[PDB]
TrEMBL record, chain A:
TM spans (from-to): 1-17
Disulfide bonds: C62-C68
UniProt-annotated glycosylation sites, renumbered to this chain: N75, N80, N89, N101
Annotated compartments: Host cell membrane; Host endosome membrane; Virion membrane
Domain of life from the UniProt record: Viruses
Included stretch of the parent chain: 510 to 652 of 847
Subunit structure comment from the entry: The mature envelope protein (Env) consists of a homotrimer of non-covalently associated gp120-gp41 heterodimers. The resulting complex protrudes from the virus surface as a spike. There seems to be as few as 10 spikes on the average virion. Interacts with host CD4, CCR5 and CXCR4. Gp120 also interacts with the C-type lectins CD209/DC-SIGN and CLEC4M/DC-SIGNR (collectively referred to as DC-SIGN(R)). Gp120 and gp41 interact with GalCer.
Protein's UniProt name: Envelope glycoprotein gp160
UniProtKB/TrEMBL annotation, chain C:
Range within the parent protein: 510 to 652 of 847
Subcellular location as annotated: Host cell membrane; Host endosome membrane; Virion membrane
Name of the protein this chain belongs to: Envelope glycoprotein gp160
Subunit structure: The mature envelope protein (Env) consists of a homotrimer of non-covalently associated gp120-gp41 heterodimers. The resulting complex protrudes from the virus surface as a spike. There seems to be as few as 10 spikes on the average virion. Interacts with host CD4, CCR5 and CXCR4. Gp120 also interacts with the C-type lectins CD209/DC-SIGN and CLEC4M/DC-SIGNR (collectively referred to as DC-SIGN(R)). Gp120 and gp41 interact with GalCer.
Disulfide bridge positions per record: C61-C67
Residue intervals passing through the bilayer: 1-17
Sites carrying sugar chains: N74, N79, N88, N100
Species assigned in the record: Human immunodeficiency virus type 1
UniProtKB/TrEMBL annotation, chain E:
PTM notes: Palmitoylation of the transmembrane protein and of Env polyprotein (prior to its proteolytic cleavage) is essential for their association with host cell membrane lipid rafts. Palmitoylation is therefore required for envelope trafficking to classical lipid rafts, but not for viral replication.
Subcellular locations according to the entry: Host cell membrane; Host endosome membrane; Virion membrane
Glycan-linked positions: N5
Protein function: Surface protein gp120: Attaches the virus to the host lymphoid cell by binding to the primary receptor CD4. This interaction induces a structural rearrangement creating a high affinity binding site for a chemokine coreceptor like CXCR4 and/or CCR5. Acts as a ligand for CD209/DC-SIGN and CLEC4M/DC-SIGNR, which are respectively found on dendritic cells (DCs), and on endothelial cells of liver sinusoids and lymph node sinuses. These interactions allow capture of viral particles at mucosal surfaces by these cells and subsequent transmission to permissive cells.
Domain characteristics, as noted in the entry: The 17 amino acids long immunosuppressive region is present in many retroviral envelope proteins. Synthetic peptides derived from this relatively conserved sequence inhibit immune function in vitro and in vivo. The membrane proximal external region (MPER) present in gp41 is a tryptophan-rich region recognized by the antibodies 2F5, Z13, and 4E10. MPER seems to play a role in fusion.
The species this protein was found in: Human immunodeficiency virus type 1 (HIV-1)
The family this protein is said to belong to: Belongs to the HIV-1 env protein family.
Entry superkingdom: Viruses
Full protein stretch here: 83 to 133 of 847
Name of protein: Envelope glycoprotein gp160
Length: 125, 445, 124, 121, 51, 53, 53
């Protein structure tokens, strides 16, 4: 029984095999006065937060899957720790802190070299 | 060579429409627990680095007189002021005859009042101006408030100030706001220096009549824009290069005395006035106004009006329109302003002293909104406020004059024109990213 | 990095490279008379995006950007060649010559998709 | 509007072409609050089922097949007895009390189906 | 669900949840008094005799 | 006179509405989690080991 | 209804009016209304005919 927010502080590679145990609760928006206006402005946050990440996922590679790879060559300006250190004795929370300043720079290079694939997909035909 | 069709997500198409806009502030209100009228605290903070983007190889039509976003600006200010005046003290049982005595600009009006305890009579006195009280008699000194007939007079909330801090309007996501800063913009025409912005700059929600204060200066030179110069009833909006400044105050030092109406409601008024009494005045420096007026008439002689122009004062009649409205520190001014237009332009005082009276009970929002009157509470001490004149509202007079061109009157008397002088270069569009185009692709499947 | 609404009046071919720069900054912006205006305009962007997110999600696309359709381009509407539309007009210029047909175009692009879903379904 | 709730009384096999004309129209002062609450309600009706469709097989299409066994405890009508002499209104009235246990069955062997792609990669 | 090998810096004197908690109790009690009887003509003289 | 005739508008607690505090539960919307430190003898400000979501 | 008159405004209090007739001009009459015979009982006959079931 893993549950929501299971191996969070555990090994990064250990959590890399258990993505679906906590990704389901981010999904499943099915259902199965002061606080009337508190519900209205917070139920819209349920559809804002869920759909706010399904736009970025569907653009890059991920249509209906959780692990989609791209062709960005992983530039060396940011952190370049080896495989045996990132996936063995480090956690996801620690990883995002070291790379937080470069999340937008890494992201903005992913939608490009994706239209370069989409245009090459159309031009091939 | 058969052609198929393909779709495209991310196509820039504008086809402008109408939406509902945001509110943004600069988050510079370090003074906490102020909570001014326009709810600047209740707007989204933290919008730094307004990264504008330049547009090139683009032509599209800007409009200002047919704009509907300024209607939303005028709709908010009616609602913003009306909702602020609701949840505080009303003073409606003050529609009583007043036995006043001259003390003069101000009066020593006294009346019988009933306290919070019923069936009690207390002899309390306040101070009112001539613009707030009217008599219904022949020569008796009885007085009553100006708007007691078919209107409700409420008191402005005392702990909420009237400071004109700027706010920023923003369209919702997916709606873009365009702007034109091409030099010497006509007002209604295509633009070339088009630049999309995330959302517009800081509007100043100050209310004024016959002039414009704390606006944005012109980019190159003094520009004049209108819809048609041949019509008599259409307004004229101007913009200045060099801002005209006023260093003025209101020496009327006094103290505020709390007079009970009531069941938890409190009526504020000035009491024992202290010092030598003086009237409200403002200095406008010469060699900076007629020099400014010299720049205005340089292209007022251009191909809209030919020659023999002349400046005149207001038409007169209804007092609430013809004078120049003013507001600083929580007090509303209604000022004599004929001395700035007593000249003729055709081809020794240092400063211009404008006399001005004070109107505590205003009726400005009632005649357009019907929300109600407003009793401005007195402000302790002597107040001083300095502002820059950045625009004027001029209106020609209809008539016949064979020898000369018709006169110019400054009595525009409108509310929507006060916000079109700064929103003159903004336009809201909706971005639908869809679009189709042919190519050579078959969807192999 | 041309920014949001960058090469918008530019060449068709250049505008075919930066479709996605107008997609990431489309719904994610900054986040009681101002409060109701805040709420009634924030939800106005969510439902407007979903109004034409189905339109991508029905015809040919699932979540992708440039998906092909088998509509054979009937010659009733504008018949400019490949070297004309992709060379010296912008997207705003192209939308002015096709705007009234989109009622007939959209109901035809969604057509020949149910005709396609059967072909994959019966083959299995 | 042309065929909104269209051939609902016709042959069950005539629903092959009429899905699009219906799926296209799932989203088209205290009085404004009541009017706004209906607008956000339609945002929940649609996309509350698209999240469901986005789970199992139908991410962006209308017809997706599933490898569930479809046992014979419920009705045993064949392909001809279902797709020709029946309407969808009558069809959903027969499996109305069984679709609750049906919906969790497609989820079974679906998260397990998502495991092999991770296992392969 | 419990969490293992986890650390986090907590606080309770600057928590924003209790600040929202104070906002409701003001609002719920104030809204409960509006749409029924008021008693404002009562602040009058009261001839009071001790029982 | 009544004690509150200063600076207050005195209303009446509404007769058909009770004051009984029935327990309520505060709950975060989807996409938000609440962290609970159920460790024994919590100091008030500092690290916690038995953090439960 | 023959009731042609000039309405009067009564100063109830601060900024309020009370419109009531006090100046009726002409001759007083009771308000009558026509319902045409040979058509209403024609309808009433049709009402009971379908009630004969
Ligand atoms: C056009 O814009 C100008 C801006 O220069 C504006 O003039 C200012 O008006 C305000 C209105 O009250 C004047 O009062 C100030 O209000 C601010 C509000 O936060 C106060 O902080 C100021 O206090 C300062 O000074 C105190 C000493 O007297 C300090 O103790 C205190 O810490 C502050 O530093 C002050 O009360 C303000 O003085 C003027 N500014 C100038 C330069 O004259 C004008 O009103 C605008 N036009 C219109 C028509 O409103
Ligand atoms: C206004 O008229 C009053 C007369 O009622 C003048 O006298 C004041 O009367 C009140 C009421 O008893 C006293 O509390 C004040 O102390 C009186 N004033 C003085 C100076 O003795 C009053 O002077 C007049 N002028 C003003 C500015 O109030
Ligand atoms: C059209 O107007 C834009 C302004 O919106 C010009 O961009 C600015 O040009 C000035 C040159 O005087 C620069 O100092 C600014 O830095 C420019 N703005 C930015 C954001 O960089 C643009 O140059 C104008 N076009 C032409 C051809 O002059
Ligand atoms: C505002 O001030 C001007 C300037 O004083 C007023 O114009 C004067 O009006 C009086 C009326 O009695 C005349 O006697 C003066 O001759 C006028 N001045 C000049 C220079 O001619 C103006 O009337 C004032 N506004 C109002 C509404 O009275
Ligand atoms: C009004 O005009 C004055 C002077 O023309 C402006 O004061 C200058 O403002 C600029 C930028 O805001 C500063 O760089 C200068 O240092 C200011 N001058 C002085 C002498 O300090 C003022 O900003 C204008 N606007 C307002 C609202 O007062
Ligand atoms: C961390 O907290 C959890 C509960 O929040 C503890 O789990 C409980 O432990 C007690 C033992 O005292 C058992 O009686 C309960 O049955 C447990 N709860 C459940 C749901 O099984 C856990 O022991 C705590 N761990 C530490 C190290 O303090
Ligand atoms: C109603 O009663 C009044 C008496 O209270 C009649 O007399 C009117 O009285 C008022 C008040 O003094 C005068 O202004 C009117 O001029 C009186 N009427 C006439 C005709 O003289 C009044 O006539 C009665 N009827 C109506 C319809 O008002
Ligand atoms: C018919 C038409 O619009 N032609 C234009 C014109 O600018 C020119 O013939 C060509 C290349 O310069 O680009 C295209
Ligand atoms: C996580 O905690 C468990 C508890 O016994 C321990 O066995 C495991 O080694 C820990 N893992 C890490 C990466 O600290
Ligand atoms: C990597 O980042 C550095 C830092 O700016 C930059 O100079 C370099 O060109 C980048 N290289 C690649 C391949 O992106
Ligand atoms: C993590 O574990 C590795 C291998 O056991 C070792 O380098 C060390 O114990 C940890 N790494 C660091 C940087 O402390
Ligand atoms: C990230 O950028 C900020 C800039 O405000 C800087 O203070 C911080 O040190 C940066 N992070 C790292 C890990 O260098
Ligand atoms: C009301 O004020 C006037 C002012 O002189 C006074 O004569 C009159 O007696 C007052 N009324 C009462 C009831 O005291
Ligand atoms: C009112 O009476 C005084 C006293 O004689 C007189 O000076 C004044 O002129 C009169 N006012 C009017 C308008 O008759
Ligand atoms: C009542 O006040 C209005 C103000 O709009 C005024 O025009 C009217 O003359 C006043 N009535 C009387 C009888 O003076
Ligand atoms: C400005 O626009 C008006 C109408 O929009 C036009 O009549 C006038 O000639 C224009 N002025 C220019 C282009 O200088
Ligand atoms: C301006 O007025 C003239 C005549 O007074 C009229 O012909 C013209 O159409 C007006 N301008 C506009 C934009 O309507
Ligand atoms: C207005 O006052 C400021 C503050 O001292 C001063 O710098 C400025 O020169 C004054 N301007 C005029 C016209 O008096
Ligand atoms: C204004 O009046 C107050 C109180 O009457 C006094 O303290 C202050 O000194 C006065 N201002 C001046 C400039 O004298
Ligand atoms: C403008 O005003 C200045 C004030 O000193 C004066 O010297 C100058 O002659 C005036 N010019 C005109 C054209 O009135
Ligand atoms: C201004 O207009 C009025 C209106 O009658 C006129 O009497 C006066 O002479 C005009 N002023 C000038 C300087 O022409
Ligand atoms: C206004 O101009 C006229 C011109 O004849 C002059 O007689 C009068 O004194 C001027 N008034 C003021 C206040 O400048
Ligand atoms: C776009 O503008 C550039 C500016 O130099 C120009 O070279 C180019 O030809 C223009 N393209 C179009 C399609 O107008
Ligand atoms: C193309 O459209 C026209 C008019 O809409 C129609 O008459 C013609 O039959 C269509 N051709 C094809 C092949 O669909
Ligand atoms: C599109 O059809 C409408 C319908 O009448 C018409 O007004 C418009 O001119 C048409 N557009 C083009 C580019 O022909
Ligand atoms: C047979 O049908 C029942 C439905 O009642 C189902 O629960 C069961 O799993 C089915 N058997 C198999 C082997 O799938
Ligand atoms: C189950 O199937 C058999 C034959 O396959 C059929 O005779 C029977 O009627 C079916 N059960 C039901 C409840 O229809
Ligand atoms: C189809 O169903 C109806 C309804 O029971 C029945 O009357 C008819 O005979 C059936 N036809 C066939 C061919 O099964
Ligand atoms: C569906 O199943 C339920 C099980 O409780 C039953 O009560 C109901 O009658 C059934 N409906 C049918 C057979 O139409
Ligand atoms: C009511 O208010 C007055 C003035 O604020 C104060 O003097 C009085 O003491 C208050 N009542 C009581 C009972 O304290
Ligand atoms: C509790 O926290 C305070 C400040 O956060 C600290 O001063 C104190 O030493 C702590 N007590 C402990 C850890 O027992
Ligand atoms: C009723 O009285 C009004 C009073 O002005 C009059 O205009 C009207 O003609 C009268 N009605 C008839 C039918 O004469
Ligand atoms: C209905 O009333 C009319 C009156 O004109 C009469 O002639 C007719 O006979 C009546 N019909 C019946 C059925 O009573």
């Amino acid at each position: 029984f893993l549950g929501f927010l299971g191996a969070a502080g555990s090994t990064m590679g250990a959590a890399s095999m258990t993505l679906t145990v906590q990704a389901r609760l981010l999904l499943s928006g099915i259902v199965q006065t002061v606080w009337g206006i508190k519900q209205l402005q917070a139920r819209v946050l349920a559809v804002e937060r869920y759909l706010g990440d399904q736009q970025l996922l569907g653009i890059w590679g991920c249509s209906g899957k959780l692990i989609c790879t791209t062709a960005v060559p992983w530039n060396a300006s940011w952190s370049n720790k080896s495989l045996d250190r990132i996936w063995n004795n480090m956690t996801w929370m620690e990883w995002e802190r070291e790379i937080d300043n470069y999340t937008s720079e890494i992201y903005t290079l992913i939608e490009e070299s994706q239209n370069q694939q989409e245009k090459n997909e159309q031009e091939l035909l | 060579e058969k052609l198929w069709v393909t779709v495209y997500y991310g196509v820039p198409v504008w086809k402008e429409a109408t939406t509902t806009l945001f509110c943004a502030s600069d988050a510079k209100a370090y003074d906490t627990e102020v909570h001014n009228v326009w709810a600047t605290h209740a707007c989204v903070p933290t919008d730094p680095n307004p990264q504008e983007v330049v547009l090139e190889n683009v032509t599209e039509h800007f409009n200002m007189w047919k704009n509907n976003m300024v209607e939303q600006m005028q709709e908010d200010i009616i609602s913003l002021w009306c909702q602020s005046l609701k949840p505080c003290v009303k003073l409606t049982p003050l529609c009583v005859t007043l036995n006043c005595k001259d003390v003069g600009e101000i009066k020593n009006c006294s009346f019988n009042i009933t306290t919070s305890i019923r069936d009690k009579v207390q002899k309390e006195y306040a101070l009112f101006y001539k613009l707030d009280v009217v008599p219904i008699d022949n020569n008796n000194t009885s007085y009553r408030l100006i708007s007691c007939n078919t209107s409700v007079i409420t008191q402005a909330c005392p702990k909420i100030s009237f400071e004109p801090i700027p706010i920023h309007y923003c369209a919702p996501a997916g709606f873009a706001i365009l702007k034109c800063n091409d030099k010497t913009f006509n007002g209604t025409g295509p633009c070339k220096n088009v630049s999309t912005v995330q959302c517009t700059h800081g509007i100043r929600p100050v209310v004024s009549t016959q002039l414009l204060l704390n606006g944005s200066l012109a980019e190159e030179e003094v520009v004049i824009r209108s819809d048609n110069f041949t019509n008599n009833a259409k307004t004229i909006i101007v913009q200045l290069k060099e801002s005209v400044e006023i260093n003025c105050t209101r020496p009327n030092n006094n103290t505020r005395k709390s007079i009970h109406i009531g069941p938890g409601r409190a009526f504020y008024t000035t009491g024992e006035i202290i010092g030598d009494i003086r009237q409200a005045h403002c200095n406008i420096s010469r060699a900076k106004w007629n020099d400014t007026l010299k720049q205005i008439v340089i292209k007022l002689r251009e191909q809209f009006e030919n020659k023999t122009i002349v400046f005149n004062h207001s038409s007169g009649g209804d007092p609430e329109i013809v004078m120049h409205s003013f507001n600083c520190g929580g007090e509303f001014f209604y000022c004599n302003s004929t001395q700035l237009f007593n000249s003729t332009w055709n081809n020794e005082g240092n400063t211009i002293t404008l006399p001005c009276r004070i109107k505590q009970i205003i009726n400005m929002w009632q005649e357009v909104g019907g929300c109600g009157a407003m009793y401005a509470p007195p402000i302790r001490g002597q107040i001083r406020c300095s502002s820059n004149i950045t625009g004027l509202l001029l209106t020609r007079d209809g008539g016949i004059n064979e020898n000369g061109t018709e006169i110019f009157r400054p009595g525009g008397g409108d509310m929507r024109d006060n916000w079109r002088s700064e929103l003159y270069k903004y336009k809201v569009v909706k971005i639908e990213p869809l679009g189709v185009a042919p190519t050579k692709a078959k969807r192999r499947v």
